[PDB]
């Protein structure tokens, strides 16, 4: 039993809701919140900008030190950093950004990072300004993630479209 509330069950291990991931994290304080990161951990907009702004820029400060030490992530890769006031940990995961010309095939690799954590509050990878088909991303999520994932989808029309089209 966990404290997530109001989620629609899609499969044994994937759940979904129309909500801001920042608000879900503020309420649940999950062990892991997933950030929709880029390779430079520059948290400029979307989920990343929202998470970072909710940390009063502490996420960005920590991320800049990470990059200075380790260099950029790989597309499809991840790193574990602090969750600051929102969660115990933040798993920064890089889905491909089609508006940058990044390879959409890497979306499965990106979701594989979720399997290293038993429970996660996560966004839909490569959605929004990353430019991928959200129906496909939800499909890849369900067909790749085996651990328990709670997907918070901010955009109401997107949530409704995803539910009505899910197979």
Ligand X SMILES: CO[C@@H]1C[C@H](CO)N(c2ncnc3[nH]ccc23)C1
| Binding interface with ligand X (CB under 6 A) | 20-22, 46-47, 50, 123-124, 127-128, 152-155, 158
Smallest distance from ligand X to CB 101, Å: 19
Smallest distance from ligand X to CB 18, Å: 9
Smallest distance from ligand X to CB 142, Å: 16
Q: Compare residues 120 and 152 and give the one whose CB is closer to ligand X.
A: 152
* Residue 51 token pair: 């998470």
For residue 69, give every residue at least 6 positions away whose Cβ sits within 8 Å of its Cβ, in sequence order, or none: none
Q: Compare residues 34 and 79 and give the one whose CB is closer to ligand X.
A: 34
Q: Compare residues 62 and 155 and give the one whose CB is closer to ligand X.
A: 155
Smallest distance from ligand X to CB 46, Å: 5
Q: Compare residues 71 and 89 and give the one whose CB is closer to ligand X.
A: 89
For the chain, strand residue ranges (E) read 8-9, 14-18, 32-36, 78-82, 89-93, 119-122, 148-153
* 139 in Cβ contact with 167 (< 8 Å): yes
Give the CB-nearest residue to ligand X: 128
* 62 in Cβ contact with 80 (< 8 Å): no
For 2-117, strand residue ranges (E) read 8-9, 14-18, 32-36, 78-82, 89-93
Q: Compare residues 70 and 136 and give the one whose CB is closer to ligand X.
A: 136
How many CB atoms are located within 10 Å of the residue 2 CB?
A: 12
Smallest distance from ligand X to CB 20, Å: 4
């Amino acid at each position: 039993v966990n404290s997530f509330s109001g989620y629609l069950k899609l499969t044994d291990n994937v759940y979904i809701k129309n909500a801001d991931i920042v608000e879900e994290a503020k309420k649940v304080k999950p062990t892991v919140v997933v950030n929709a990161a880029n390779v430079y951990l520059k948290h400029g907009g979307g989920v990343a900008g929202a998470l970072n702004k909710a940390t009063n820029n502490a996420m960005q400060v920590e991320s800049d030190d990470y990059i200075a030490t380790n260099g950029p992530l790989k597309v499809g890769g991840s790193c574990v950093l602090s969750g600051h006031n929102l969660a115990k940990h933040c798993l920064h995961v890089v889905g491909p950004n089609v508006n940058k010309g990044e390879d959409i095939q890497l979306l499965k690799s990106a979701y594989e990072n979720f399997n290293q954590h038993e429970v996660l509050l996560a966004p839909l990878l490569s959605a929004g300004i990353f430019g991928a088909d959200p129906i496909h991303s939800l499909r890849v999520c369900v067909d790749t993630v085996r651990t328990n994932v709670y997907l918070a989808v901010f955009d109401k029309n997107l949530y409704d479209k995803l539910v009505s089209s899910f197979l």
